[PDB]
Design an enzyme around this catalytic site. Structure first.
Site, PDB file in Angstrom:
ATOM      1  N   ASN A  35       0.847  -1.190   0.000  1.00  0.00           N
ATOM      2  CA  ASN A  35       0.000   0.000   0.000  1.00  0.00           C
ATOM      3  C   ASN A  35       0.884   1.243   0.000  1.00  0.00           C
ATOM      4  OD1 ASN A  35      -2.851  -1.239   1.908  1.00  0.00           O
ATOM      5  ND2 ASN A  35      -2.673  -0.720  -0.274  1.00  0.00           N
ATOM      6  N   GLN A  37       1.347   6.968  -6.612  1.00  0.00           N
ATOM      7  CA  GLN A  37       0.175   7.667  -7.128  1.00  0.00           C
ATOM      8  C   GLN A  37       0.139   9.116  -6.668  1.00  0.00           C
ATOM      9  OE1 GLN A  37      -2.642   3.685  -7.732  1.00  0.00           O
ATOM     10  NE2 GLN A  37      -3.391   5.360  -6.441  1.00  0.00           N
ATOM     11  N   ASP A  84     -20.242   4.445   5.365  1.00  0.00           N
ATOM     12  CA  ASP A  84     -20.615   4.294   6.778  1.00  0.00           C
ATOM     13  C   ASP A  84     -21.765   5.262   7.052  1.00  0.00           C
ATOM     14  OD1 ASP A  84     -18.283   2.597   7.417  1.00  0.00           O
ATOM     15  OD2 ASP A  84     -17.120   4.449   7.195  1.00  0.00           O
ATOM     16  N   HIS A 126     -12.160   5.056   8.840  1.00  0.00           N
ATOM     17  CA  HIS A 126     -13.059   4.119   8.189  1.00  0.00           C
ATOM     18  C   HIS A 126     -12.570   2.760   8.664  1.00  0.00           C
ATOM     19  CE1 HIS A 126     -15.570   2.006   5.430  1.00  0.00           C
ATOM     20  NE2 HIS A 126     -14.537   1.429   4.842  1.00  0.00           N
TER      21      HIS A 126
END
Ligand SMILES: NC(=O)c1ccc[n+]([C@@H]2O[C@H](COP(=O)([O-])OP(=O)(O)OC[C@H]3O[C@@H](n4cnc5c(N)ncnc54)[C@H](O)[C@@H]3O)[C@@H](O)[C@H]2O)c1
Ligand SMILES: NC(=O)c1ccc[n+]([C@@H]2O[C@H](COP(=O)([O-])OP(=O)(O)OC[C@H]3O[C@@H](n4cnc5c(N)ncnc54)[C@H](O)[C@@H]3O)[C@@H](O)[C@H]2O)c1
Lengths: 327, 327
Positions: free
Chosen positions: B105, B112, B159, B187
Site C-alpha cells: 500500500n 500515485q 458508513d 473508516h
C-alpha cells in the site's frame, strides 16, 4: 408528487441484477421524479445473496426507493406490478442440455406469464432479458392470455447500442450523433444490424462507410461483441446489458426522441412481411408508454435476405416450443 | 454544456469500479450537463479485464462520455485529471501480513501521490476508497507536497449512508427524511456514527430512539454492515461503495443540501481538538469543490470518548507508516 410505481425484477441476485437494481432505484429508468417500489424475485438457492443485495440497496439511501421486497414467489413479486423485467432464466449447468434448458425455461416463463396475468397491473410493461430472450418472451405472453401481447417484449437494445458504438468508432464521431440505428430479428447470431437508414450527424451512414466494411466487419463484430466481453473480462456483459434494459424500459415509458427510433423485439403483427406471433426486433418509436413499429422503410435484397434468415430462426425456435406443448 | 472534465479511477477493473464507472459516465456524479473523460488505471494483470470494461462502457452509448482511455501508467491516468478516485489498493491474500500489506500500500500511494503532483491539475480533487482509506490518503498527500493536502480525502460516506439507512429503518421514516448524520474518524471498526445532532423529519433522533438501542444496536450494526454483506452475498459491498463514492464527489463538487451536511475524512486542522495531519472524518458542508468542517457542535462525553478512540487509532496507523519512512 408522483405516486410510486412497482418494478418487479427476476434473477435479482445475478450479475445483470446487480448492475440493474441500483440505477433503477436511483431513478435512471423511469425518471428522477418517479418513486419506485422494487419487488425482487430470486430462487431459493439465491435468496440469501438476494437479501445481501437488499441491504446494499438500503445502504445507498435512495430517496426514490419507496419500497423494497424480496420473495421467492412469482405471485408476490408481480403483485400490482407496473413493470416487470424478467432477467432470470434457466441456469447454465453441465448436465443442463439444450432441450432440457428449453423445458426449464418453458416452466419458468409459463409460470411467470401466468403469474403476471393473475396479479400484475393489466397494463404491466414486460421486458424479457433472460435468454433465449425472444422465445422466452413468446412463451410468457402466450401463457398470459388476458394481457395485451404487445406488452411483452424481448431485449435487443444491447445489440442496438453495440451497433451505434461501432459506427461512432469507425466514423470517428460522437455516439450521441448516431440516429436511426436498427437491429432486426432475434437476439442471437442471426441478428441483423441495419445501416441503410442510420444517420451520422444527419448524413446517411453508408455515405461514410463502404458496404465491404459493413458486411465483413461491422455485422460480425456486433454479433461477436458479447463473446468479446466474456473473453476479455472472464465474465458476462452485465453492466452494459443492465444499461440496455434500463434504456429499453425508459424509452418505452418516456418516449423516443423526435426524428429517431430504437430497436425492440415485440410480437410481430406482419410488419415488413415478418411472420406473426414471434417476438421479432423492429425499429420502433414510443410515446406515453406505447410503441409503434416504424413502417414504410425501403428494404433492399441485402436487408431482406438477412431479415428472413433471422425470422426463420425464430420460427424454428417457436416450432420447438410448440412441439413441446409449451404454447 | 460545461467544459469536459477528466476523471481518473484506479482499480478500474475491480468490483467497485464495475459498479462505479457506468453511473459516472451516465452523469450521476457531476451532473447531466457535465461531459466526462474517463481515464482508467488498472494493474498489468487486470488490463485485459479493463479492456473489456472499456468495451462495455462504449456499448452503453453514453452521450456524456467525451473520452475513454485505459492505461497501466499512473502518469497517463492522472494526466490533467480534475478528479481522482483512488480505488485500487493492496490485495489482502494468504500469507501477506500486516506489515507486508502496509509495504505494498505504501508503494501504491507514494507512487500515485507523486504522479498526481506531477501530471494532474493543481486543483485535482482526490478521493481514496481503497483501504485502509484514511491512512492511504495520508501517504498520498504526504507524497504530493505542493498539491493542497485539503484536496485529498478518504471515504466514510458508505458508513454515513449505512447509518442513515439504519435510523430510517428503525424510525419507520423515509431515508430522505434523515439529515445531519455524522460519522467521525477512521473508516474502520472504531468509526463513530453520531446521532446527537441528526434529525428525522426535522426532529432530534434521540427523541425517537434511546441510548441503549443507539449503543448496543445502531453502532454495532453499522460497524458490522460490511461483514453482513459478505456473509449474505459471499462478496464485498461493491455497488453501495461505488454509490457512496459518487455521492462523496457529487456533494463536494456540486454542493451539500441547505441546512444539512455530510461526512468526509479530510486532513485534520485541529477542528474539535483532533490531532493535525491525520485524515479524519468530520461533519462537513460543501459547495463548488470546497468543503468546511461544521464546527461548534456540542460534544458530550459519549461522543468525545469515541472520537478520541478512533483518533488514537489513526495516530497509531500514522506512526507505523512514518516508522517505515513512507512519510
Ligand atoms: N438480451 C441480452 O442482450 C442479454 C445480454 C446479456 C445477458 N443476457 C441474459 O440474461 C440472463 C442473466 O445473465 P446474468 O449474467 O445476470 O447471469 P447470472 O444471473 O447467472 O449472473 C442470461 O440468460 C443471459 O444469457 C441477455
Ligand atoms: N467505504 C469504503 O471506503 C470501502 C467500501 C468497500 C470496499 N472498499 C475498499 O475498496 C478497495 C477495492 O475493493 P474491491 O472490492 O473493488 O476490490 P477488487 O478485488 O475487486 O479490486 C478495497 O481496498 C476495499 O477494502 C472501501
Amino acid at each position: 408528487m408522483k405516486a410510486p410505481v412497482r418494478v418487479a425484477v427476476t434473477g435479482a441476485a445475478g450479475q445483470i441484477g446487480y448492475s440493474l437494481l441500483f440505477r433503477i432505484a436511483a431513478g435512471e429508468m423511469l425518471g428522477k421524479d418517479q418513486p419506485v417500489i422494487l419487488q425482487l424475485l430470486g430462487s431459493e438457492r439465491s435468496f440469501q445473496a438476494l437479501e445481501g443485495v437488499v441491504m446494499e440497496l438500503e445502504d445507498c439511501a435512495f430517496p426514490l426507493l419507496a419500497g423494497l421486497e424480496a420473495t421467492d414467489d412469482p405471485k408476490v413479486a408481480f403483485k400490482d406490478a407496473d413493470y416487470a423485467l424478467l432477467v432470470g432464466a434457466a441456469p447454465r449447468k453441465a448436465g443442463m442440455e439444450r432441450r432440457d434448458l428449453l423445458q426449464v425455461n418453458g416452466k419458468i416463463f409459463t409460470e411467470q406469464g401466468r403469474a403476471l396475468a393473475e396479479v400484475a397491473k393489466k397494463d404491466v410493461k414486460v421486458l424479457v432479458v433472460g435468454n433465449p430472450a425472444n422465445t422466452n418472451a413468446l412463451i410468457a405472453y402466450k401463457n398470459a392470455p388476458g394481457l395485451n401481447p404487445r406488452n411483452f417484449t424481448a431485449m435487443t437494445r444491447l445489440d442496438h447500442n453495440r451497433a451505434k458504438a461501432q459506427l461512432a468508432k469507425k466514423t470517428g464521431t460522437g455516439v450521441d450523433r448516431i440516429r436511426r440505428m436498427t437491429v432486426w430479428g432475434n437476439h442471437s447470431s442471426t441478428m441483423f444490424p441495419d445501416l441503410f437508414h442510420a444517420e451520422v450527424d444527419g448524413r446517411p451512414a453508408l455515405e461514410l462507410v463502404d458496404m465491404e466494411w459493413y458486411e465483413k466487419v461491422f455485422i460480425p463484430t456486433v454479433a461477436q461483441r458479447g463473446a468479446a466481453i466474456i473473453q476479455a473480462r472472464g465474465a458476462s456483459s452485465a453492466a452494459s446489458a443492465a444499461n440496455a434494459a434500463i434504456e429499453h424500459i425508459r424509452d418505452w415509458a418516456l418516449g423516443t426522441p423526435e426524428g429517431d427510433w430504437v430497436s425492440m423485439a415485440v410480437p410481430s403483427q406482419g410488419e415488413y412481411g415478418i411472420p406473426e406471433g414471434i417476438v421479432y426486433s423492429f425499429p420502433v418509436t414510443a410515446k406515453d408508454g406505447a410503441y409503434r413499429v416504424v413502417e414504410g422503410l425501403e428494404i433492399n435484397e441485402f436487408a431482406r435476405k438477412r431479415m428472413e434468415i433471422t425470422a426463420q430462426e425464430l420460427l424454428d425456435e417457436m416450432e420447438q416450443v410448440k412441439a413441446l406443448g409449451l404454447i
